[PDB]
Amino acid sequence: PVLSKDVADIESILALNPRTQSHAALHSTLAKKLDKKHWKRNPDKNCFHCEKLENNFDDIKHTTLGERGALREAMRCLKCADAPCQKSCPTHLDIKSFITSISNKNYYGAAKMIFSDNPLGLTCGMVCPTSDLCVGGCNLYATEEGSINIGGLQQFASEVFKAMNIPQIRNPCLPSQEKMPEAYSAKIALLGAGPASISCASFLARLGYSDITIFEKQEYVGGLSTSEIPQFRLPYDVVNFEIELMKDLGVKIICGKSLSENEITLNTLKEEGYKAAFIGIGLPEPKTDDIFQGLTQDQGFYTSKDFLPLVAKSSKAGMCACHSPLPSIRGAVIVLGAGDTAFDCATSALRCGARRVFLVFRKGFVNIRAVPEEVELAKEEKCEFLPFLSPRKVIVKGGRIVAVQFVRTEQDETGKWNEDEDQIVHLKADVVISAFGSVLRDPKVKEALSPIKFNRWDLPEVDPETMQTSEPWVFAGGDIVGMANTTVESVNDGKQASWYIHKYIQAQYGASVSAKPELPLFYTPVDLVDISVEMAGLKFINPFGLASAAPTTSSSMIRRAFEAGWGFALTKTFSLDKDIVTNVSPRIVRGTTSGPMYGPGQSSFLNIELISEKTAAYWCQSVTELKADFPDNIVIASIMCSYNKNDWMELSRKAEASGADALELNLSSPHGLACGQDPELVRNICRWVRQAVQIPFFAKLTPNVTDIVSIARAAKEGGADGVTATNTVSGLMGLKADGTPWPAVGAGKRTTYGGVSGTAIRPIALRAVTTIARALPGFPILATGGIDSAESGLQFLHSGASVLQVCSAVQNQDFTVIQDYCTGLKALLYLKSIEELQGWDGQSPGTESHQKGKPVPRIAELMGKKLPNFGPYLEQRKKIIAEEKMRLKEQNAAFPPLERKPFIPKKPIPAIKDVIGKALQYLGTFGELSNIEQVVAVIDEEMCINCGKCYMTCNDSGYQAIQFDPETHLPTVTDTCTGCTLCLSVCPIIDCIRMVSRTTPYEPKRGLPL
Amino acid sequence: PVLSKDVADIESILALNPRTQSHAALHSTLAKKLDKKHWKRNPDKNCFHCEKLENNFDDIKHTTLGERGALREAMRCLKCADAPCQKSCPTHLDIKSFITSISNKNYYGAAKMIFSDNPLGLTCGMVCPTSDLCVGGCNLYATEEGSINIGGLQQFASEVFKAMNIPQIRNPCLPSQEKMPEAYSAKIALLGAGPASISCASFLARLGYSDITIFEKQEYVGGLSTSEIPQFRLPYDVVNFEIELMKDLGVKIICGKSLSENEITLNTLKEEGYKAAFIGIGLPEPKTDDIFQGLTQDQGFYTSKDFLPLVAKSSKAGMCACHSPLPSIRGAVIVLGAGDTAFDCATSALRCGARRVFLVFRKGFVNIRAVPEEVELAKEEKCEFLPFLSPRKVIVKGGRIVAVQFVRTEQDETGKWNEDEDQIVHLKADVVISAFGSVLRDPKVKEALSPIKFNRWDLPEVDPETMQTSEPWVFAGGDIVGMANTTVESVNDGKQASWYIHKYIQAQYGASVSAKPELPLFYTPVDLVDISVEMAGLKFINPFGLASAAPTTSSSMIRRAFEAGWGFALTKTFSLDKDIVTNVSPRIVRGTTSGPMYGPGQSSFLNIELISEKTAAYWCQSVTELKADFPDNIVIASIMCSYNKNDWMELSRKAEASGADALELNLSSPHGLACGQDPELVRNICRWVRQAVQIPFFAKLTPNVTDIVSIARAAKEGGADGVTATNTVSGLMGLKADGTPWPAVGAGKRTTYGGVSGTAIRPIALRAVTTIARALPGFPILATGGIDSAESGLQFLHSGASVLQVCSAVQNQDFTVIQDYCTGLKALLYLKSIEELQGWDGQSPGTESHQKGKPVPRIAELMGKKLPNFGPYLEQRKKIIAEEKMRLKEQNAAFPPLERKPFIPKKPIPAIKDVIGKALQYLGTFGELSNIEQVVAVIDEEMCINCGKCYMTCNDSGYQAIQFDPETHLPTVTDTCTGCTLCLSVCPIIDCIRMVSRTTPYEPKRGLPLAV
Ligand SMILES: Cc1c[nH]c(=O)[nH]c1=O
Ligand code: SF4
Ligand code: SF4
C-alpha cells in the first residue's frame, strides 16, 4: 500500500482540517443568511420576545468568573502604583495586591486582603456598581480591550476562600481575653443587621471588644442583601457566609428586637448600661404616591418593599423558611421608577411568570440614575422602557388592576419638569409595582432616636468624618444617613464609625487611642502557619529572598525589602577595587519568549549587565548597617574575583568581617571560558574561600554547562556549604527586522550575548535543582530561576531547594510581592492538613463542569444529548432548562446547615522542612517509566467551546484520532488515541480534556510490521 | 553617612511606591465620593449632558485598534477549525488565517487574505455590524472575556497595508493580455459605483476581463459608503483607497451617467455591444410619508437622503468637487425611525450643532432594527429615545416647524399594531429628519430596466444563487435586490454575480467554465518575490520546513504539509529494527513558561517522547513515495544509531538508497551522556556517515552542552555538510502542589527530564546559531527553536541559518501556517526595497502618539500641559478639543488628500542569500561595546496610561530615577537615569518610553569613593 497517503477513513476524519485555499470562495448571500442562524452564540437583534425565565434564579451577572477566566483577567491587570481603582473604591481595597495574588494562584492571600478592608467582600464583588466605583477609575480604560473586571476577580477569590471553609480568628496581635483592659468589655449595641452594622461590629470585634450585640427587627439577617437584592445576582449563601465570619469574632445577633418606642430606644439602652450605639437600620419604608392609596396586593399593587421580599422568600433557601410560592404575576407588569430598585423589580417580575414588563419613568433615558450594568440586565431580558410618563390613575375592574393612566412629562428650558394634562397614556396592565425608593417615616422609630438631631430630610445628622450623631455615644451609617447608595459605602460607614466608637469608648474609660487610625486586618488560622526554615546553620524567617540582581542594586533597596518582609537578600555581586566595572546601556530588555505581550508578567528578561558598579567598601559597610538594623534577616554577600587565590581569600575575608551571614561565590569570571563551567576551577575557588572564612558560603552555578551536577559536586568537594542553582541562561533575545539586535549599544548597534532570566528559564532551573538534589542528597540548595509565586516556590522546595531567590518577578512588579508569597505559602501548607480538600490542587478547587464560569445544570435531559451552546442547540438547551425550573416550582428545596462548621486540620501543619525534596521520589530515568500503563484523552462536551484546536493539533501533530462533528463542532477522541497529550496541552478550557487510563488494547503503530 | 538608607530626596521620590500595610485604611464615604471624580476614566452616569460635538468628526468606533491592541487581540483568538465566525461572514473571510497572520506580525498576509475574499475589506472592518455577523458566531463568546474584535483586527491589518502604498496587480496566473481569448474583451457595463459593483467589477477584472466600465450617476464614487455613512465611522480616504486598488486592475469609472430612460438603458447598452450588465444602483430614493408633503429644508424638514449627504459633502475632503460648511441644525432635532440610518442621523445632527436630539420610533425598544453597537453610539452621546409614537402632523408656524404631533401605538393581543387616536404627544422641535428607509421609485429608472421582471417588493427579481435577472445578460445585486442589509452582503452579491457573469459571457463566445467556481485571490507585487534558497547543494523552494518531531509522526502528514506549501520536511527520527522504541503516555505537555494562559500561543512544550515508533522500512518506503510525488520538496531523513560504526553506515546507506535528499544525524543516543555532548563522538559519527553516503548530511546539535561550537566544529571536521541547531533544552516543566509531576506516567505518577521546545527556547537557539555562524563562516546551519513567524524566521536567517525548521508553532496551530510564513517573508523582503518605508520595523509602522489606538490631536493647547486622560484633566482636554473643532469650522479647512502614487522599489528586492548572516556584524564581546554611548529613558506623556510600572520597576529594580506625579499619575525620568532600560521593558504601551542618547555626562554610581 501507499504508506504516505491517508486511507479513506482518515481522509474522512480530516474533512474539517484547515487547508490552504487557492481561490476565493463562492457562497450566496441567501445561503449565508440561512447558515448564520446555525452558529449564533450571542443575542439575536431580531428576536423580540422574552426568554422564558419563570422560577429561573440562575446567576445572570456578566462579571462572574471561573478560575480560567480569573487567571486570565488577573494577569491582564497592570497592578498599578497608587492605583486609581483603589482611590475609587469606598472601602479602599488594595486592588493591586489582591489581583496580584490571584495572578499568582494565591486565592487565600487575595481573600484575606479583600476582607481586611471589606468584611462583606464577597457580597460587594457580586453587587458593587463598579462602573461608578473602582472600575470607572481603572487605567486600562485607556486601552481598547478596556478596564479590568475587578468585581468578578473579587468574587472569585472570595468564593474560593468560602469553599476553603476556614474561619476568621481573633486578631492574634491582641493580648488574651483575660488581659484586655476593662474598656473592651463595654456593652455595645448596633441596630439593624445589614451591611453597615455587620461591618461596624466586625471592626469593633477586631479591635478586641467582647460584648457586641446587633439587634435586628426582622427574623432574617443581612438587610437588603437578604430581603431585596435578587438571588440571581446575590446568592443568599454568600450573605450567610459573611455573617458566619463575623460571628467567629464573637458578635451576637438578636432577631425580633426593634428600635422603636415601646421596644429598644436610645434611653432604654442607656439605662440598660450600653456604652455606645450604632444605628444601621437603613430606610425601612417605601416611598409612596397618594394615587395608590387603598390599592391592595390582591388587586395587583405592590411597593418594591412588598414585592422583592416576597420573591426573596421564595428563591433563597433558608433566608425565611416560610415561603408563599412565587407571587402570581402572570400578565403585563408596570414597574414605576428608574432607580436600580425598579430594574430589580422588572427582572424579578419575569421570574414570577410576567408576560411583559414595562419600566415607566417620569424623566428621560438620559436621566436614569441606575448604573448601566443594572440597566443592561433588564434590557437583555427584553423589558420595555417608557420615558416621560408620570402616573395619574390606576383603573380597577372586577377586583383587579387593568390599566394605569399616565400624563406625559416634559422639560421647558429652565429645567422645570412640567406635566401636560392633554397628553395621556392608557397602558393596560395586571400588576403595578412602585419603586420610587425608600424613606424613614415611622414615628415610633424616630421617637426612639430621641434626642439626636435630624436634618431637612428627616434623617439622623452625623459628622461625616466620625459618623457620630449629636449624642456622642450614638453613631449612625449606611442608608439611614442618606449618603451611601451602595453596599460598599454602607460597609465603609460602619468601618469609619468603628474607629470613632473605639475612641469614644476608650476615652470614657480614661484611655487614649492613636492619633492615626489603625483598624486591624482580617486574620484566619492560616496566618499562624510557621514558614521559617533552617539551612546551612542559618535561620530564615521565611524562605524568600532577593537574588543578586537589579533589585539589590543598592543596599537602601535591600532595607526596604526587609521592611516589606523579605526573609533574606543577596548583595549585587561586588569585587575588589582593581576589578571595578562600568555598565553599558541599554542593558536589560523584555523577553520575546511569549510573543508581543507588553506590560505585566514578562515571561523573561535578557540582561547584559555586569557585577555591581559600587565598591566593596560600600557593600561591606552596607552589610554591617543592614545586619545591625535587621539581625533576623539573612544577608548574603555575593562576590567575584578572577581565578586568583589571594584575591578570593582577601575579598571573602572582607565580606565576612563586614558581618555577612554567608557568602555567595559568583562563578561567572572568565578564565569553557567561565570558572563555573570547569569543575576543577570551581573546586579550587571553593577551597580557597573555605580556608579564608569561617561562615557558610554557597557556589552560584551557571546552567550553561554540559553537566551541572559535576560543578555542584566540585563545589562540595572544595568545601562549599551549598549551591545556588542557577544563574541566567546564555542567550540572544532577538533582532529587529533590519537585523540589528536588542539591546543595541551605541551608534554601531552592537550587542553581546546576555543572560535570560524569568519564567522562561524555570524548566531549566527546576531540572538543575532536582538533578543536584538527587545526586547529592541533603546538600543545601538555594533556588533561583523563574520563581514568581508561592506555588512555583513550593515546586522548587519539593524539588530539593531550601530557600528561594527572586529577581524577575520583582522586576515585573515591586518588593511587596513578598506579602503574597508568604500568605500563599502559609495557605498551601495549611491546606495539606485539611482532609476535606485533598481533591484540590493546592489552592485550586477541582474543576466542575462550567461555561463562562457558571456551572452547567445537572439535568438528565441535557447530559449527553450533544447540544453545544450555540444556534438551535442552544435554544433547545434553554427550553430544557426552562422546563426543569417549572417542574422545580413544585418541590421542596433543602436548607443549608443553620450555619456551617469549619474544616479542622487533622495533622500538624507541615513545616518547610517537611516538604523539601518530596517530589524527588517521582523522578527517574526513562526506563523507570511504565510503557504499559498508557492513557488516552477524553473530552467533557459540557465544558468544550467548540474551537477544534484539539482536532487540529491531533491532525497535524498527532494521530488523526479526533472526530470533529461538522454540525455541533463537538470533538470525540477515538480508539486510535495514543495519549501523547498534545490536545489537552492546547485546549483553552482548563480540564475540559483529561487523560484517563486506557481501557483498550494499546498497540504501537509500526507503519510496516517488523 | 548611612549608605543603606535613602536620603530625604529619594524618600520623596519614593512617596507613591507601594508598601506592605499592617492596618486597614480609614477613608470617609464623603471623602471617597469627592475623590472619585479626580480619577474618573469612563462616562459619569450622573452626567445628563455630554461635551460639545459640533464639527467633531473624529473616529468614534469602539472597535478601532492600534498595533499594541491588535497584537493582543489577535493572540487571544483561538484560530479555530471550520471557524463559525467565517461561516457567519457573508464574504466567507478566512478569519482564522488572517488573524493568525496578524498575531505573527504579518500584516501584509492578513490584508491579502482579507482582500482576496472582500475587495472592500477595510470599509467592512470599519462598518460591518459584526455582532449580527462574524462575531455573533465567535466561539470565544463562551468565555467571560468574550468574542474577538474581528472587525477591528480586519481594519488594523488593512490600514497597515494601505500605509504600505502597494498596488494591486493583475492576476499573475493569467496569460499576457495579447494571449487572452477574445471572450475576455467583451464589453461589460456596471451601473452605480457602490460596494456591489466595485466588488463585481473587481472580481471580473481578476478573471481577466479587460473592458469593464462602471457608470455612476453622481460626481462622487463609493455609494452609501461615501454619501451617507458618517466620516466619524468611515473616513472617506478608505473608500478612495479601495477604489484605487480596483483601478489598478483596469476597471473604468464614468461619473455623471445615469441608468434612466433617455440616458443609459438596457436597450442602449445592448445596442452598443455590451455583452453583460450588472445593476448595482442601490435604493436611490427616500421612503416618504404623506404627512411631510411640501415641507422643505428651510422650514426644518429633511429625509435621511437630504441630510446625510449634506453632512458627508461637508465633512469628507476629496468626496466632491464642491466644498461646503455643515448644515445649520440648531435647536431640538427629531429623528424618525429606528434603523441604523436614524442613528447616523442622530449622531450627525450633533456634529451640526443640535441642542437636543430625539429618536422617535413607532414600536418599542425590543423592536429597534439597529445593531446594538450603532444604538450605543447614540445612547452614549445622550440622544433621547421615545418609543411607541407614530407621527400624525407637523406643526408649522412662521413658515417653519415648531412641533410634531404623534399618536401612541400599541400591539394588540394577537400581535398587530394599533394607533390610539386619543393618546397624543406634542413634541417641540426645530428640525425633523425622517429615516424611514429607502426605495426604488423613479419610473424613468424602472423603465430603463425593461424588460426584466420585478417582484411584489417593486424590486428586480434575481436567481439568488446566480444574481441573474429574467434577462440572461443582466445581473443585479446589493441594496437594489433587497436581500443585502450591509456593505459586506452587497460586496458578496457582486462577488457572487461575477462568477455567473463570467459563465454567461464565456458561453456566448462558445467556451465553458468549470462547474466549480474559481474566483482568483488578491495579488500585489509582493507575491512575486522569490524566497527560494540554495544550501549544501540542495534547492529549497522556500526556507520553511517541518522539524523531525510530532508534526512528522507519519509520512502522510508530510504529504499534507508539502501540499500546503512547506518547502522541506524531516522524517521523525528512525532507527534500525534492533533499536525500536516504545513511547509512554502522557508525554507532551504545555509549557508553564508564561503562566496560566491556556489555548493558543503556548510559549513552550515539554516532551518525553522517543524516536519514531515506526520502522526504518516504513520510513524508507515513505521517503521514496514522497520524493516520487514531490520532487521539488526537500526530504531529509533523520536517523539515529548507538555509537557503532556499522550501524551508522548501514542506516545512512538505507536512507540514502530510499532517495532522501539529505540526512540528519540525531545525536541524542546515550553513549555528558549523549553523543552530541562529546566532540570526539560526533566527529567519529560524521566520519562514518561521510564514508557511507554521497548525499549531504547534517549533525543535529543539542544545546545542552558547555560549548556548542566545539561540537559543530567536530561535525565539520568529520565531514558533515552542515549542522542543525538546536534540539530541545533539558528541563522539567513543573509539579502540582502535592509534588507530583506533569507529565505523570503510570500508577507511580513518575516522570523523567524532558525537552523544552517553542518560543521559550528561542534565545538559546539564536545564541547557538549566531555563535556557530561566527565561528564557522559559511558552514550551512538549519535553525530550529521557537520559529513561529516569518519575522522570527528572518531573525534566524540574519543570524546565519539558511533554512528554518518548525515544530512547536505547528503543534500550536496546524500546517497552514506555512502560507503566513511565505507571504510574511515575501513582504519583509519587498519592504527593504521601499525607501519611503525605511522607518518601519519590518511590517510595523513607526508608532505615533495614540490613546486607545486613536491618534491624539496635534493641538498646541493640549501638549506639554500635563493633562492626562482622566478626571478634571480629561474634561479640560475635551473642552480644548471642542474649542479647536469650532476653529476648524471658522478657518481655511479644505484640501483634498494627495492622491496615491504607489511606492516603487528603489533597490533590488533582496534574496534569501542576501540576508543570511547580516546580523553577525553587530555581535561581539562585551569589550566591543561602548560605555560612553549611554542612553536615558524618556516618556511620551501623550501615550502614557498612568500605571506607574516604570516607577515601581525603577524603584525596586533600578535607580529611583522616576518622579511619579501624585495628581496626574504622569511619570518623568530625571537625570539619575542610568539607561538600564527596565522601565521601557515593562511599559504596557509600545514605544511610549524610548531610550535616547545621554546629553549630560555619564558618571557611574559607585557608593563610596574608590580608594587605593
Ligand atoms: C554578573 C552577572 C550579570 N548578569 C547575570 O545575568 N548574571 C551575572 O552573574
Ligand atoms: S467582512 Fe465583515 S462580517 Fe466578514 S469577517 Fe470582516 S467584519 Fe466580519
Ligand atoms: S509604564 Fe508606560 S504607561 Fe505606565 S506610567 Fe510608565 S510610561 Fe506610562
Side-chain angles (χ1 to χ4, degrees), chain B residues 16 19 83 232 242 248 283 336 345 349 356 372 415 421 472 499 524 653 681 710 737 740 753 828 839 896 905:
Chain B
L16 265 55
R19 295 186 276 288
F232 47 75
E242 289 163 343
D248 294 338
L283 301 171
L336 304 169
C345 292
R356 206 161 172 51
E421 283 324 320
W499 175 261
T524 86
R653 279 169 167 158
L681 305 187
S710 67
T740 61
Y753 311 106
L828 291 169

Side-chain angles (χ1 to χ4, degrees), chain B residues 939 944-950 964 971 987-989 992-993:
Chain B
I939 302 184
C944 182
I945 66 168
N946 310 99
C947 72
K949 280 185 60 55
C950 50
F964 194 59
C987 175
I989 301 307
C992 169
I993 313 191

Side-chain angles (χ1 to χ4, degrees), chain A residues 287-319 321-610:
Chain A
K287 176 158 199 93
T288 56
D289 194 335
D290 292 344
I291 62 175
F292 293 145
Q293 183 197 117
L295 296 162
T296 76
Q297 278 186 26
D298 276 359
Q299 303 164 313
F301 181 75
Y302 305 76
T303 61
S304 64
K305 282 278 180 272
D306 309 283
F307 179 65
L308 290 167
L310 281 168
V311 181
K313 293 168 190 142
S314 303
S315 52
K316 294 173 179 195
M319 146 175 186
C322 308
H323 66 320
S324 164
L326 279 175
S328 100
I329 295 299
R330 333 187 82 67
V333 172
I334 292 184
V335 177
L336 309 161
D340 314 283
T341 301
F343 287 88
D344 272 342
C345 285
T347 58
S348 294
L350 292 176
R351 271 95 184 156
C352 296
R355 305 273 92 180
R356 312 145 280 280
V357 178
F358 298 87
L359 284 97
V360 174
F361 46 88
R362 68 161 162 209
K363 282 155 174 181
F365 282 72
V366 317
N367 311 106
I368 298 188
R369 58 179 296 256
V371 72
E373 40 265 52
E374 255 285 29
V375 176
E376 197 269 355
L377 294 166
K379 177 177 267 292
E380 83 182 9
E381 294 185 0
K382 307 285 109 205
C383 299
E384 197 69 56
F385 307 79
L386 289 45
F388 298 111
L389 289 175
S390 166
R392 275 312 182 72
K393 314 196 217 164
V394 175
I395 293 263
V396 181
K397 302 222 181 302
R400 277 321 281 231
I401 291 161
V402 288
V404 179
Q405 194 192 130
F406 305 76
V407 294
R408 305 279 175 169
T409 67
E410 103 187 65
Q411 265 176 336
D412 50 24
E413 283 199 27
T414 180
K416 183 171 71 178
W417 279 101
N418 280 326
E419 265 157 72
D420 303 323
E421 305 279 346
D422 59 311
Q423 298 170 52
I424 73 166
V425 180
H426 179 98
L427 178 68
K428 308 182 225 143
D430 309 310
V431 169
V432 176
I433 306 164
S434 66
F436 299 142
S438 286
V439 287
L440 173 70
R441 290 213 186 128
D442 195 337
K444 284 183 20 74
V445 179
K446 313 176 234 160
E447 180 178 18
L449 284 172
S450 175
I452 72 171
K453 176 118 208 313
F454 285 66
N455 56 34
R456 228 176 272 201
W457 305 280
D458 231 329
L459 297 177
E461 282 182 40
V462 301
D463 182 333
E465 172 67 28
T466 66
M467 308 314 294
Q468 190 172 56
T469 75
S470 60
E471 292 292 310
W473 70 284
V474 180
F475 294 69
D479 275 8
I480 183 62
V481 163
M483 219 171 315
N485 320 314
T486 64
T487 305
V488 60
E489 289 175 304
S490 306
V491 172
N492 192 56
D493 279 1
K495 185 179 192 197
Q496 191 80 12
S498 70
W499 176 257
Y500 293 98
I501 290 156
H502 167 58
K503 199 183 168 202
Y504 175 76
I505 290 174
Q506 299 290 320
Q508 285 297 299
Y509 285 75
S512 57
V513 304
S514 159
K516 205 183 128 203
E518 279 131 43
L519 281 184
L521 304 169
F522 171 97
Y523 297 97
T524 78
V526 176
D527 305 312
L528 317 175
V529 172
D530 184 334
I531 58 173
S532 66
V533 61
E534 181 254 287
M535 162 195 104
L538 301 172
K539 169 142 289 153
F540 295 80
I541 61 176
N542 63 68
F544 301 96
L546 298 175
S548 180
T552 56
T553 293
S554 299
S555 50
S556 60
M557 328 166 42
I558 299 173
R559 169 177 303 273
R560 293 193 285 104
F562 287 166
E563 291 168 339
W566 286 85
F568 71 101
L570 283 283
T571 65
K572 260 289 288 193
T573 298
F574 62 97
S575 63
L576 301 157
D577 283 355
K578 58 193 213 200
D579 293 329
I580 201 79
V581 301
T582 299
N583 273 324
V584 301
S585 60
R587 53 173 186 282
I588 312 157
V589 306
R590 70 174 276 280
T592 52
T593 40
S594 55
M597 291 294 273
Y598 297 80
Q602 292 306 295
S603 69
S604 70
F605 296 90
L606 178 130
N607 80 80
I608 57 172
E609 195 159 270
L610 298 177

Side-chain angles (χ1 to χ4, degrees), chain A residues 774 798 917-924 928, chain B residues 738-741 748-751:
Chain A
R774 283 181 98 243
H798 274 156
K918 287 302 219 275
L920 296 175
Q921 62 182 299
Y922 303 113
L923 266 286
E928 301 175 69
Chain B
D738 62 3
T740 61
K749 299 218 137 274
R750 307 199 44 86
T751 200

